[PDB]
A paper describes a structure:
A Lineweaver-Burk plot analyses indicated that stigmatellin is a competitive inhibitor whereas the others are mixed-type. There are no significant differences between the structures of the complexes, as indicated by root-mean-square deviations of 0.58–0.76 Å, which were calculated for 454–462 superimposed Cα positions. On the other hand, the electron density corresponding to myxothiazol extends from the si-face to the re-face of the FAD isoalloxazine ring. The bithiazole group of myxothiazol is located adjacent to FAD and forms hydrogen bonds with the FAD isoalloxazine ring. The binding cavity of myxothiazol is constructed by 10 residues: W63, P238, M280, P390, T392, Q394, H397, A446, L447, and M485, six of which (W63, Q394, H397, A446, L447, and M485) are also found among the residues lining the cavity for the head group of stigmatellin at the STG-1 site; four residues (P238, M280, P390, and T392) are specific to myxothiazol.
Author numbering:
A (entry chain B), B (entry chain A): 28 to 146, 164 to 419, 425 to 513
């Protein structure tokens, strides 16, 4: 259905841009999500030839690479989100955002089922764009999600402060010696990837740069462990850099735990195992005030539910396996991009950003084809008209290390433009992250956020 | 300290500045609150000759004038607050803040009982500076607390935005010609002092500027009413100005209800009554989605608690009555300033920023007279010393109106510098306010707020 006067998420709003007919003139494309995929895919697609619809529980778009800077308020949570709406005021034709969530996609009955928590109730789709993202992975390691914080989404950032704020508080009522005070003030990040390292760093920044400047008795006793399973951190960088980073984290009093896996999280301590290069399996408990879980990504119910309803997708695990034109293997009119598509690619923004932009332009290709105005094998039409299959141009990797330092690589093709570095690198990272932001609103807010951060402390209000 | 926690809540910070002999000879001074009076008094007290400690459940100062511009993201709630610590960090001597609330003042036992919501538990004092503010008042009109929203404190801003969004949301799923949609978009501000005005003003902005740019279907139907019991809005501005303000309010589509009083408040609607030129009371139902009740202050219960414990304050209705030396009539060592003090002046912030600065210089002027500590018309102690009493240098009256306009009136004694005006006044007004802000950080943040507003919309997130 998907008609007038229902109840999904209340920003089920329609923007009557151009002048269409009531007899359906265009294909109804329906996007799932409002993140990198869906916003990148929306940002380009020809709205004159297609009737774009978006289904997102979230009504803003998240510039994920600056999220780890939110909790301490290096950046404000607003300063890095954008409403979907503003990207639709930049589309010539017609859009509609339902503020709900996909639940079961019904591939052959040909709808996405939106049931919200803010109320049929399905939505007809001619084509489907499935960029819902991955949800983070605990590995069945018990205790996470009882006692952990995922660094995924804006609320997650608010939860992490409120927690750390509350510990800083409780902690400052105990006599200096007390171990408990020592515990409250400890931080465990679990995740050696960029996210974790950046959170790890951004906290330690705050503690050195801000906290001590008015309660130095606490600053000291703050401890920030960073825990990773593999031989070293930042594995996407060439060995020589990953080391400089690990140098600089420990330089900033970070307790890096390489080759270490979390077997279980209890309330106050997380039982860790370590397997050394001389294969010796040692144990260790790590007590924690605040636990951050910056690791992994698994598939979502919508998708793992879909796996069954498409014979080819029975045994895909990571995401939806996709052919070279990014359609679901097993379905005609259903596509998948970014973290929920299994392209055999890095699960990153860069990939999803390209993935979407290519698919966007291929949608302009198909409109020129009368053959696509109507018609269980599927790819055929993409060959008959000579469509380029998607190939990826991995552009390199940035990561921020703490107390004003960074490392990076940039590339195009086999060519490898640049690679830092230290305090210089920092200013590119800033200058570069700025440019990759998808809105002038957001960028000015972040810009102002860093200028403000020079003259003054971060804003660490627990109720805001 | 040490460990003096028993009543007082978490952010019990202490700055170990000067070297303190356990057994002290400096007097001990207590400031109740963290707003205009208290923070003004904190700023100008000599922290070397005295020892100052504070009690406030609120860990931040609030630039109360800008509050009404936060609910519609004209300005961020963080931009207008600044922490106590941040002020106390720029002092000479030892400051301490027990983040809690006074529950009982104990005049004849020299203590203030503090039961923090977050936890004996008395605090000892030589001198007491009672500056807790007043609370807002319902005049026992049934319904206000249930369905209404005060506009007194930061959380109230979030409460309103949340409310208004949820209605904008719920309304857009109903068809243009529904009553229930008309209602949800109705907005009644009760009380036409510059608050209710500026508020009403700043909403209509968001409707007229933000909302319409993406839902004119909703925007148009949004109605803002301003109810006021008196002949005119903004009585403290001179007669001719009150009419131009009202001209401009009504001319920006704001239904202004003079000589009108809210007899009661129900969920969907509020019954109001209006006395006419001819002295005949009519009735009326105003149905409403959002109810901002910005009218009249009343006596805090700690202040009312302390009316029974002093014979002079037995017939004290409005607030603690004080002499020309701002001292609680009937106590020696307690002082009341701000809206908890009934100094027969208006309950402005302007008053309190004077009431403080003055008392601080008094307090400093009690550092060349070594008899007070070797001490029934106890104001004579000051009169015989030849203490200049307190006099209010009324600096004026400001009020923003909506849609880029403002009214103003700077003066001193009689010598009136100015009285506008239009788009020029809005600019001055901005400038005056921006100057009167108490911290660099607040200022800058407020300054970048306004810039971002010219470039981009406002920020109306219902979870941030
Ligand atoms: C803290 C953090 C920092 C990162 N930093 C970087 C970086 O610096 N560089 C980099 O390349 N990558 C980074 N990433 C990874 C990158 O952001 C992701 O790979 C990218 O977000 C994938 O985009 P996507 O569109 O596939 O999914 P997302 O961007 O996650 O978008 C998924 C969207 O779908 C919505 N949604 C969820 N469930 C449903 C449902 N059932 N129905 C409808 N909609 C739904 C979500 O609200 C969201 O809008 C980071 C990730 C995190 C968590
Ligand atoms: C939205 C709004 C806008 C305004 N704009 C203006 C304006 O432009 N110009 C103007 O002159 N006036 C304005 N006012 C009025 C003016 O701000 C007040 O008269 C002024 O705040 C009084 O200051 P105060 O120090 O007496 O109390 P406040 O400034 O309210 O501060 C009182 C403090 O006491 C704390 N507190 C309360 N109870 C307790 C307790 N039991 N124990 C400990 N602490 C406690 C509070 O958290 C607060 O920090 C405005 C008021 C509002 C609500
Ligand atoms: C906006 O478009 C872009 C560049 C441009 N000049 O416009 C880029 C595509 C832009 C930047 C991408 C980018 C910057 S920096 C970075 C990065 C750092 S690290 C990483 C990968 C290798 C990490 C993946 C981790 C995955 C886990 C979930 C397992 N990617 N990606 O896309 C967001
Ligand atoms: C310039 O600095 C100041 C004093 C000084 N330097 O001595 C002031 C205290 C300054 C501004 C005060 C101000 C601005 S605008 C205003 C005012 C006049 S009137 C009013 C209404 C809102 C409040 C109460 C009215 C009560 C009855 C008269 C109805 N507000 N007062 O600090 C905030
Ligand atoms: Mg995203
Ligand atoms: Mg997406
Ligand atoms: Mg994702
Ligand atoms: Mg995805
Ligand atoms: Mg205040
Ligand atoms: Mg005060
Ligand atoms: Mg007050
Ligand atoms: Mg007061």
């Amino acid at each position: 259905t998907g008609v007038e006067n229902s109840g999904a998420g209340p920003t089920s709003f329609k923007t009557m841009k151009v002048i269409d007919p009531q007899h359906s003139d265009k294909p109804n494309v329906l996007i799932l999500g409002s993140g990198w995929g869906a916003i990148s895919f929306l940002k380009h697609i020809d709205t004159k030839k297609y009737n774009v619809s978006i289904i997102s529980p979230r009504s803003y778009f998240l510039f994920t690479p600056l999220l780890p800077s939110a909790p301490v308020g290096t950046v404000d949570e607003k300063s890095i989100i954008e409403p979907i709406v503003n990207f639709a005021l930049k589309k010539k034709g017609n859009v509609t955002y339902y503020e709900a969530e996909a639940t079961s996609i019904n591939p052959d009955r040909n709808t996405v089922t939106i049931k919200s928590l803010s109320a049929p109730a399905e939505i007809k789709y001619d084509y489907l764009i499935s960029a819902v993202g991955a949800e983070p992975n605990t590995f069945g390691i018990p205790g996470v999600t009882d006692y952990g914080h995922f660094l995924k989404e804006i609320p997650n950032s608010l939860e992490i402060r409120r927690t750390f704020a509350a510990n800083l508080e409780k902690a400052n009522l105990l006599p200096k010696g007390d171990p408990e005070r020592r515990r409250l003030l400890s931080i465990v990040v679990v995740g050696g990837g960029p996210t974790g390292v950046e959170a790890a760093g951004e906290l330690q920044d705050y503690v050195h740069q801000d906290l001590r400047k008015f309660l130095p008795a606490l600053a000291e006793e703050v401890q920030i462990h960073l825990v990773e399973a593999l031989p070293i951190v930042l594995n996407m960088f060439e060995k020589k850099l990953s080391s400089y980073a690990q140098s600089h984290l420990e330089n900033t009093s970070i307790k890096v735990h390489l080759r270490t896996a979390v077997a279980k999280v209890e309330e106050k301590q997380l039982l860790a195992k370590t397997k050394h290069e001389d294969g010796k399996i040692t144990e260790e408990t790590i007590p924690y005030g605040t636990l951050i879980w910056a690791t992994g990504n698994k598939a979502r119910p919508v998708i793992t539910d879909l796996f069954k309803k498409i014979p080819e997708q029975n045994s895909s695990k990571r995401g939806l396996a996709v052919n070279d034109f990014l359609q679901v293997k097993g379905s005609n009119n259903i596509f998948a991009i970014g973290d929920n598509a299994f392209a055999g690619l890095p699960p990153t923004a860069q990939v999803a950003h390209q993935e979407a932009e290519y698919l966007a332009k291929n949608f302009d290709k198909m409109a020129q084809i009368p053959n696509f105005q109507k018609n269980d094998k599927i790819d055929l039409l993409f060959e008959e008209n000579n469509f380029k299959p998607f190939k990826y141009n991995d552009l390199g990797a940035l990561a921020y290390l703490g107390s004003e330092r960074a490392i990076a690589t940039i590339r195009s093709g086999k060519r490898t433009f640049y690679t830092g570095g230290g305090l210089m690198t920092f200013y590119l990272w800033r200058i570069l992250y700025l440019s990759m932001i998808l809105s002038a609103r957001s960028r000015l807010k972040v810009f102002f956020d860093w200028i403000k951060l020079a003259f003054f402390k971060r804003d660490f209000f627990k109720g805001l």
